[PDB]
């Protein structure tokens, strides 16, 4: 009974809207623009993970380091607890040692 | 619930079709029908 009895409303996707049409443009800004701008500078998103990647523990540490002072009180408490738990898990648990 | 199973009905039916001719709940309840059908096969 976890199956719907009617077809869902048709999902129409415009493959040629502006976003999809111009997707990927300026990804070669560096190599094709005398390296004035690195492609990572085209990344719009959280300040603490622009042009950067890492596991959950590294991401949490970076968030606390970079925007920790601007975080809300309970969000920062949650982040501190999450960092503590991730530290314990990654440094004391796992199949391999 | 990023990814949810939507075929569970057909997954259940693939087993129940072989149990439709059993006796009792073994022909209706998957938790029982699956065991009986495996034994039957």
């Amino acid at each position: 009974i976890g199956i719907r009895l009617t077809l869902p409303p048709p999902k129409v996707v415009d493959r040629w809207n502006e976003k999809r049409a111009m997707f990927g443009v300026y990804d070669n800004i560096g190599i094709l623009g005398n390296f004035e701008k690195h492609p990572k500078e085209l990344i719009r998103g959280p300040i603490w993970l622009r042009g950067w990647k890492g596991n959950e523990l590294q991401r949490c540490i970076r968030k606390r380091k970079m925007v920790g002072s601007r975080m809300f009180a309970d969000d920062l408490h949650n982040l501190n607890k999450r960092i503590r738990y991730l530290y314990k898990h990654f440094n004391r648990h796992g199949k391999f040692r | 619930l990023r990814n949810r199973v939507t075929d569970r009905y057909f997954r259940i039916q693939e087993v129940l079709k072989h149990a439709r001719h059993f006796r009792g709940r073994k022909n209706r309840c998957y938790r029982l029908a699956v065991r009986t059908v495996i034994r039957a096969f």
Binding site: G2, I3, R4, L5, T6, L7, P8, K11 | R4, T6, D7, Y9, F10
Partner: peptide, 26 residues
């Protein structure tokens, strides 16, 4: 509601089959 279309389509086909079996056409 579970997002997706293919399971719903399969169930629609099964419902059509059951409808035909219950009320076979002339």
């Amino acid at each position: 509601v579970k997002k997706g279309f293919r399971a719903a389509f399969r169930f629609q086909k099964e419902l059509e089959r059951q409808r035909l079996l219950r009320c076979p056409p002339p």
